[PDB]
Amino acid sequence: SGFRKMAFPSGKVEGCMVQVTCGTTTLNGLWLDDVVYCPRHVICTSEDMLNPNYEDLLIRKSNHNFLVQAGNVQLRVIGHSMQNCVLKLKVDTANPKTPKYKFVRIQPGQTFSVLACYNGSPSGVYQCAMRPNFTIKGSFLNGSCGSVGFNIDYDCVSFCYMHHMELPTGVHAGTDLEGNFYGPFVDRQTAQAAGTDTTITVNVLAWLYAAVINGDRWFLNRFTTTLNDFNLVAMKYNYEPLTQDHVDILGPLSAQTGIAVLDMCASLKELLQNGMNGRTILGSALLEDEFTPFDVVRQCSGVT
Amino acid sequence: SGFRKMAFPSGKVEGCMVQVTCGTTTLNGLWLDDVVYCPRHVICTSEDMLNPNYEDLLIRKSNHNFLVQAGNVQLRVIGHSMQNCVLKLKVDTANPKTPKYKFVRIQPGQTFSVLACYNGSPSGVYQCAMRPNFTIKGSFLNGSCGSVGFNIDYDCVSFCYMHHMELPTGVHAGTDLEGNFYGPFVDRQTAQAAGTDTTITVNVLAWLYAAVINGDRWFLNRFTTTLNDFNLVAMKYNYEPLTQDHVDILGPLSAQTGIAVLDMCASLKELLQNGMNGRTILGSALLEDEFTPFDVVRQCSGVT
Ligand SMILES: Cc1ccncc1NC(=O)Cc1cccc(C#N)c1
Numbered sequence: 001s002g003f004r005k006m007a008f009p010s011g012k013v014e015g016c017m018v019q020v021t022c023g024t025t026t027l028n029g030l031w032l033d034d035v036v037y038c039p040r041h042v043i044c045t046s047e048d049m050l051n052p053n054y055e056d057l058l059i060r061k062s063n064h065n066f067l068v069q070a071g072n073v074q075l076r077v078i079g080h081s082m083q084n085c086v087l088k089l090k091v092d093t094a095n096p097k098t099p100k101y102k103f104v105r106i107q108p109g110q111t112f113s114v115l116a117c118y119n120g121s122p123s124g125v126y127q128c129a130m131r132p133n134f135t136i137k138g139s140f141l142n143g144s145c146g147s148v149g150f151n152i153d154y155d156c157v158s159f160c161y162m163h164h165m166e167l168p169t170g171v172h173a174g175t176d177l178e179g180n181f182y183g184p185f186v187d188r189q190t191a192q193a194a195g196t197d198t199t200i201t202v203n204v205l206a207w208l209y210a211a212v213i214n215g216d217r218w219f220l221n222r223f224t225t226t227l228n229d230f231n232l233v234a235m236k237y238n239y240e241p242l243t244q245d246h247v248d249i250l251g252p253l254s255a256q257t258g259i260a261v262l263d264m265c266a267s268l269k270e271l272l273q274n275g276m277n278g279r280t281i282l283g284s285a286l287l288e289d290e291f292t293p294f295d296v297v298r299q300c301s302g303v304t
Numbered sequence: 305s306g307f308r309k310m311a312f313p314s315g316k317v318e319g320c321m322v323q324v325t326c327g328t329t330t331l332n333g334l335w336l337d338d339v340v341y342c343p344r345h346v347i348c349t350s351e352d353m354l355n356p357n358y359e360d361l362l363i364r365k366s367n368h369n370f371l372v373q374a375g376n377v378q379l380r381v382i383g384h385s386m387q388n389c390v391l392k393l394k395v396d397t398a399n400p401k402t403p404k405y406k407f408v409r410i411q412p413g414q415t416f417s418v419l420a421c422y423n424g425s426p427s428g429v430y431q432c433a434m435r436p437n438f439t440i441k442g443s444f445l446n447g448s449c450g451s452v453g454f455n456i457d458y459d460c461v462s463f464c465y466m467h468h469m470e471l472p473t474g475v476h477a478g479t480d481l482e483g484n485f486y487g488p489f490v491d492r493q494t495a496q497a498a499g500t501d502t503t504i505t506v507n508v509l510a511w512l513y514a515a516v517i518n519g520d521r522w523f524l525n526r527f528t529t530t531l532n533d534f535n536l537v538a539m540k541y542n543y544e545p546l547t548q549d550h551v552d553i554l555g556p557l558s559a560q561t562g563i564a565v566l567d568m569c570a571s572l573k574e575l576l577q578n579g580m581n582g583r584t585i586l587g588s589a590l591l592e593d594e595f596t597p598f599d600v601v602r603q604c605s606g607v608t
Pocket residue numbers: 039041049140141142143144145164165166167186187188189190305
């Protein structure tokens with residue numbers, strides 16, 4: 001028992017972190033096989049960031065201008081290319097610690113672990129979720145760009161995020177490992193505002209199930225609801241609409257607890273309408289939405 | 305910017321996790337140099353747990369009864385001894401992945417990272433705090449015993465906790481790496497109740513400083529207080545008494561923000577008396593106490 005915001009063990013990703021320097025800009029790179037992936041804004045000066053033309057800026061850069069350091073040893077750059085907003089630096093040495101891996105582009109609501117790095121060195125690991133407005137609420141300072149987000153399935157690391165930018169509001173934006181930004185953000189020092197940060201309803205329901213599994217049952221009520229009635233309440237509270245696909249994904253949690261999904265939806269509806277009343281659920285005074293139904297099943301079963 | 309419950313990167317500790325089996329009981333062990341550390345209750349059957357005499361139970365065990373597996377290979381046990389509530393299994397092979405390490409016994413209020421393991425395999429990493437009642441609010445299932453708590457200082461891993469037990473209330477109890485339980489708990493299947501789980505005041509103040517550093521300033525008031533006035537309020541709310549040692553440790557945060565420690569104490573006092581009023585601080589609707597002043601400084605500066 002006990003329910004914690006848990007990140008995947010970071011070991012497999014620590015073995016891939018390198019430092020990439022171009023001119024006076026130093027950030028993090030991800031070294032898989034003989035390629036180092038890093039944000040393309042590594043080639044920019046603070047002046048260049050105002051309105052960069054990356055293809056033009058890249059013309060003045062050669063293989064030798066990209067300094068890649070793994071631990072205390074220098075990697076030799078034998079090729080460089082730009083794929084969307086990431087740079088792929090081909091090195092002459094394959095990473096001996098390359099785990100089995102995939103590049104995946106996740107959907108909003110999906111969670112992942114972040115290994116926050118500075119100068120190619122890991123400082124911490126935390127669990128995140130891709131917000132419905134395609135931002136992430138991370139913990140990143142200057143130098144953290146190139147830090148990555150990932151999920152692990154036994155021995156295969158699915159990389160889903162690479163940190164690129166901090167918006168004027170302090171929230172974060174980044175790309176998948178193909179260099180495509182999540183959301184409408186661009187790698188430019190221009191004011192870009194995020195959309196509505198709505199609550200991931202399916203995740204809140206999954207966490208309510210986790211709370212029931214752990215003994216926190218005070219919020220369970222004598223009511224039920226329909227998907228349409230529930231969604232009228234959810235829209236009012238800036239909660240994402242719940243679909244039958246979400247109901248399907250909650251099935252194993254409904255089966256384990258014997259609480260029908262629509263019954264848990266009715267409990268959630270009363271929590272939104274009445275508030276917590278100074279009470280807590282799993283040590284939290286607000287409804288947590290950064291655990292997916294898969295995370296709740298995984299944590300409650302002990303998947304390694 | 306952004307403030308997250310961050311754990312240390314777990315790589316260095318993943319390389320130490322092994323599976324220890326004795327009879328029909330399988331749990332986790334920590335392999336440092338040529339010694340495997342694990343909870344001594346690995347020698348017990350569920351029947352033995354009711355009232356175990358560990359010295360007596362150990363007489364019926366030999367080196368060959370302890371099966372230690374690291375990855376998919378078996379380690380040879382050439383010696384075994386009991387130190388307090390841990391077993392130290394001397395193996396014939398030194399762990400090639402042994403990091404620089406220390407065994408430390410932490411004080412209540414101090415935080416650490418937990419690598420939760422099952423069958424010697426890591427499943428997740430989360431950040432914890434030793435509660436003032438010497439329990440931890442972890443996330444552990446059957447098979448997680450022997451999972452460890454640690455802090456890292458650049459390249460040196462300070463191991464501070466080893467998971468042993470789940471109390472009837474679902475909270476957790478364990479030992480330092482010398483086998484001494486934190487708190488008054490014993491490794492026995494007997495009802496043991498935890499004391500008052502008070503709030504770690506110094507940690508809440510450190511997290512209020514982190515909130516100010518990140519832009520959340522709504523709670524900052526026009527008041528100040530004294531240590532004695534503050535502690536009268538803190539005692540009423542089951543908060544730990546604040547000492548001048550705690551004020552000293554908050555000094556770098558006070559200096560960075562320009563907010564005197566007693567002024568932040570007065571802000572905390574009004575938060576306790578008035579409540580949050582449906583507002584949030586760093587995305588939380590309650591006062592977080594599992595970040596030390598050192599953690600806040602570390603996260604806000606980017607220590608790797
Ligand atoms: C200072 C900081 C903190 C946390 N995360 C990231 C940062 N750094 C930045 O945002 C620098 C920057 C400026 C404009 C565009 C991009 C892109 N792509 C990157």
